Amino acid sequence: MSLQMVTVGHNIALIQPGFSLMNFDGQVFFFGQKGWPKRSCPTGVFHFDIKQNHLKLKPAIFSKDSCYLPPLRYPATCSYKGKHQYIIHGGKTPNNELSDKIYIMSVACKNNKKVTFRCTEKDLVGDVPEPRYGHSIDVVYSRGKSMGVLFGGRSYMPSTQRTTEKWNSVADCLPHVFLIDFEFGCATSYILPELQDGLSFHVSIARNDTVYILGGHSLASNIRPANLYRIRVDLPLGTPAVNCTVLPGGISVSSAILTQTNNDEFVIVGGYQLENQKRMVCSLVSLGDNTIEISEMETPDWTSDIKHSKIWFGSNMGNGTIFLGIPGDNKQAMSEAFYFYTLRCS
Amino acid sequence: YHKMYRTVKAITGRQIFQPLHALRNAEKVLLPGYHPFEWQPPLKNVSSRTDVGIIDGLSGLASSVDEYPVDTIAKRFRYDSALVSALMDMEEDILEGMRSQDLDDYLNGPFTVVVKESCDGMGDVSEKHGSGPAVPEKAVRFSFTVMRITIEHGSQNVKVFEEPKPNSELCCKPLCLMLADESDHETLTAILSPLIAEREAMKSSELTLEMGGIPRTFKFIFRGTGYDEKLVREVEGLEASGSVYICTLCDTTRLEASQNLVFHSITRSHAENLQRYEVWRSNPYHESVEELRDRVKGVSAKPFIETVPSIDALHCDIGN
Numbered sequence: 001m002s003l004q005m006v007t008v009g010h011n012i013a014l015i016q017p018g019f020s021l022m023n024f025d026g027q028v029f030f031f032g033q034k035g036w037p038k039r040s041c042p043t044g045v046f047h048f049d050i051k052q053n054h055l056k057l058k059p060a061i062f063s064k065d066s067c068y069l070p071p072l073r074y075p076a077t078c079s080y081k082g083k084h085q086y087i088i089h090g091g092k093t094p095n096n097e098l099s100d101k102i103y104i105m106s107v108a109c110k111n112n113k114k115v116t117f118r119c120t121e122k123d124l125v126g127d128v129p130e131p132r133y134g135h136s137i138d139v140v141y142s143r144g145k146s147m148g149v150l151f152g153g154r155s156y157m158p159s160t161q162r163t164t165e166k167w168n169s170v171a172d173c174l175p176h177v178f179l180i181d182f183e184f185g186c187a188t189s190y191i192l193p194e195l196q197d198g199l200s201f202h203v204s205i206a207r208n209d210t211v212y213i214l215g216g217h218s219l220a221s222n223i224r225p226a227n228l229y230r231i232r233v234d235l236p237l238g239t240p241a242v243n244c245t246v247l248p249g250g251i252s253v254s255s256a257i258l259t260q261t262n263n264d265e266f267v268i269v270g271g272y273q274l275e276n277q278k279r280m281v282c283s284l285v286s287l288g289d290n291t292i293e294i295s296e297m298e299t300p301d302w303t304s305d306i307k308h309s310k311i312w313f314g315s316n317m318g319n320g321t322i323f324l325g326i327p328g329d330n331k332q333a334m335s336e337a338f339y340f341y342t343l344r345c346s
Numbered sequence: 347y348h349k350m351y352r353t354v355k356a357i358t359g360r361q362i363f364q365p366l367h368a369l370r371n372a373e374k375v376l377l378p379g380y381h382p383f384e385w386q387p388p389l390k391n392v393s394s395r396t397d398v399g400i401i402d403g404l405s406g407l408a409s410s411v412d413e414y415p416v417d418t419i420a421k422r423f424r425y426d427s428a429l430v431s432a433l434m435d436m437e438e439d440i441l442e443g444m445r446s447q448d449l450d451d452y453l454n455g456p457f458t459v460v461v462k463e464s465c466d467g468m469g470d471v472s473e474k475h476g477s478g479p480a481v482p483e484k485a486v487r488f489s490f491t492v493m494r495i496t497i498e499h500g501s502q503n504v505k506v507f508e509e510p511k512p513n514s515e516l517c518c519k520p521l522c523l524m525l526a527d528e529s530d531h532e533t534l535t536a537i538l539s540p541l542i543a544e545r546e547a548m549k550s551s552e553l554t555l556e557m558g559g560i561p562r563t564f565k566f567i568f569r570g571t572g573y574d575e576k577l578v579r580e581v582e583g584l585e586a587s588g589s590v591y592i593c594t595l596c597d598t599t600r601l602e603a604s605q606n607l608v609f610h611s612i613t614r615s616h617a618e619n620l621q622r623y624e625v626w627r628s629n630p631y632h633e634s635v636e637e638l639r640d641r642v643k644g645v646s647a648k649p650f651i652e653t654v655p656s657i658d659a660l661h662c663d664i665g666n
């Protein structure tokens with residue numbers, strides 16, 4: 001509910017649309033740089049730290065037992081509190097390939113305000129999903145047992161339906177959800193009759209029994225489906241039970257960002273509603289035991305610099321603070337081509 | 347040209363030049379995508395439609411708002427059709443070459459064609475007389491050149507055609523043009539990757555053509571030598587310039603290069619570079635950062651373009 005302009009460090013070019021903001025004990029790290037790693041930073045992850053609305057991207061190193069990984073430009077990620085760590089999988093390479101490997105970022109050590117990481121990857125057996133981007137991953141619990149729930153984004157054509165002149169064209173994947181054990185790597189696709197087509201850059205909320213979907217864009221008819229989804233999960237002793245229901249009240253949005261403000265209390269910043277007009281108004285949500293209800297805020301004021309532009313992007317830093325950017329105006333021809341704002345929600 | 351044509355046609359009475367539609371037909375006979383041909387392997391992931399010309403360079407990208415933004419403009423040819431049109435252009439020369447080398451005008455293949463491969467950016471192309479500085483506007487081409495053509499008879503091979511001026515401006519046929527920065531990595535590889543796919547599909551194929559009234563067959567061999575230094579260090583996956591690793595053939599450090607002067611060899615290849623990058627990803631021995639840095643010899647990025655590097659004499663004597 002408060003716009004703040006940020007000044008910038010020297011290395012602007014490592015930022016790019018489609019980044020990753022990770023958080024550990026309030027300390028926030030940048031992932032997903034532009035280009036490839038350099039002699040300055042061998043990894044690509046940085047201490048994203050801001051004082052007096054001034055950012056500095058200063059490097060962060062790995063452990064010995066860590067695994068190295070390229071920057072991924074549109075992955076999916078989720079929190080794993082079971083210690084605490086992040087689960088990241090999917091994404092797009094700097095050379096525009098699509099991997100399907102599941103990397104685990106764990107904090108190795110932190111000493112004298114210098115922290116290191118313990119990156120490991122994990123593969124899967126059985127019904128593997130095809131590599132994609134714009135998809136969504138969430139962790140959910142039941143009976144004390146944890147399980148990762150996935151929902152697809154979009155991908156290329158398969159190897160038979162791919163030619164030269166259409167080598168880069170994309171299509172929505174098949175509407176299936178995958179159940180991913182992290183103790184062994186068990187993966188199982190599931191076919192759901194209420195679900196119809198693919199979906200990309202949809203917003204994903206999960207609270208301990210049932211994962212909520214919202215918004216996103218469907219490539220199949222070039223619309224934004226204005227219907228939310230409520231996806232009930234049960235994991236008994238036997239085979240796990242997946243359930244889905246359709247509820248009214250969905251808002252037609254794509255490429256927004258979620259943020260926890262208070263306990264069981266989340267908020268939504270504006271993304272896109274049509275591909276000709278930016279979506280300006282932003283929304284809230286509130287969860288109970290099983291209820292779900294949207295809400296709208298008091299339309300927090302932007303600069304006109306936003307209101308005259310065309311696009312944006314962004315993510316969240318975790319602690320009720322939305323960090324986002326905007327391409328500059330090349331008409332004035334004295335721009336650094338990118339400005340940035342931080343939106344404290346509190 | 348229309349003015350010149352109509353004025354000389356009026357003043358002489360005879361029509362010494364040609365009008366414009368005949369000029370359009372004479373240029374449509376020389377573009378890519380006119381003559382028919384086929385391939386003895388059916389060329390997987392290639393559309394076998396045989397009348398395509400200038401196609402969009404983005405190969406159907408994803409220019410919507412909700413995607414990663416890219417505002418570049420790229421126009422390209424399909425690779426096989428441009429190769430076909432280049433061969434049909436040099437048809438009369440290859441006819442008279444094989445006549446001059448004491449052979450028959452009737453001869454089936456296979457003609458083996460060795461092709462130079464190159465790429466370069468041309469810096470700024472903007473023209474603003476005022477309005478302050480307008481736009482830097484960097485752009486880059488991607489081109490090729492037929493270097494030599496050869497043919498055997500039984501077991502004895504003969505160079506049937508050699509080119510006199512390799513690096514000249516009149517023999518660099520362009521595949522694709524894009525208005526983009528040379529170092530803007532992801533856009534560059536995203537446009538150039540389908541032509542790489544077409545090249546690797548074409549590497550193990552057989553062309554069949556109908557030039558001299560009789561069919562001929564063709565194989566191909568590609569040498570990626572026409573790159574410059576900053577680009578070959580960028581698109582193969584090496585460090586830019588500030589490493590200890592300076593040799594693009596031998597893994598000699600800057601320390602050993604001052605120490606050992608000549609006693610090295612050539613030890614860099616494409617598949618081993620892929621393997622080294624996979625070692626950099628996997629990190630199988632859980633070592634530290636610097637020992638990985640010296641174990642892989644500067645390998646940092648995924649290699650994606652095969653390239654056989656070389657030099658030129660200006661850099662040699664200027665370093666001397």
Ligand SMILES: [Zn+2]
Nearest residue numbers: 593595596610
């Ligand atoms: Zn050497």
